[PDB]
């Protein structure tokens, strides 16, 4: 009676509000209906499907974007047919799709690194840094490189489109450098060579 189905509707807040899936009345009602249908099937004692820890994305006449984080890769699928013009390739983290039956570029998958992965990597760098009471500089930097390529070879194209991830990466690398420099001497230098 109050259109109260939109107050607690989870959404991928990182994307811009046009890219973010839009909360129309019909679309929110449909999403909640589908989630309730799925939840009712499973017995509440066997297991449960919590809405607040779930995400429902609807594509309809009102929403042109289909959003989902599959395995840490937040993907927004945008069909070319509906809302596109002069499709490009200048962005490296934008998967071109392909209709196998017709062999034509018909969709566009924008890739991104979700907040969970960024927070996990930041926490990993933090626990590398705090666990440095007596570890050698080489051990710290080996852990840093291993952690870096742990996700960078995993998140390859999404890193380009996730500017906040790039900022976090640079911040954490600067933290590692600052830790080593403090390990050398207490007073941080004005300059310090990359060599």
């Amino acid at each position: 009676p109050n259109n109260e189905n939109i107050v607690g509707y989870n959404n991928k807040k990182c994307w811009p509000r046009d890219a973010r899936m839009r909360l129309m009345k019909h679309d929110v009602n449909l999403g909640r209906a589908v989630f309730w249908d799925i939840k009712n099937r499973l017995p509440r004692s066997v297991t449960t499907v919590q809405w607040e820890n779930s995400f429902v994305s609807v594509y309809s006449k009102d929403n042109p974007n289909l959003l989902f984080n599959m395995c840490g890769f937040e993907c927004r699928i945008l069909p070319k047919c509906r809302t596109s013009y002069e499709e490009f390739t200048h962005k490296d983290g934008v998967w071109n799709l392909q209709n196998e039956v017709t062999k034509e570029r018909t969709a566009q998958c924008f890739l991104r690194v979700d907040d969970e992965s960024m927070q996990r990597f930041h926490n990993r760098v933090r626990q590398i840094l705090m666990a440095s009471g007596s570890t050698t500089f080489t051990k710290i930097v080996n852990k840093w490189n291993t952690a870096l390529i742990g996700l960078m070879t995993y998140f390859r194209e999404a890193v380009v489109n996730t500017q906040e991830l790039l900022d976090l990466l640079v911040k954490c690398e600067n933290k590692i450098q600052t830790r080593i420099k403090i390990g050398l001497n207490s007073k941080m230098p004005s300059r310090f060579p990359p060599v």
Binding site: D92, R156, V160, L166, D167, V170, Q177, R191, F192, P194
Partner: peptide, 22 residues
């Protein structure tokens, strides 16, 4: 000149991932 690391945000205009790695 300084050793501080500069974020490459806005530094990706003319580069690709697969370039200079064949």
């Amino acid at each position: 000149p300084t050793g501080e690391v500069l974020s490459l945000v806005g530094k990706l205009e003319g580069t690709r991932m697969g370039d200079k790695a064949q």
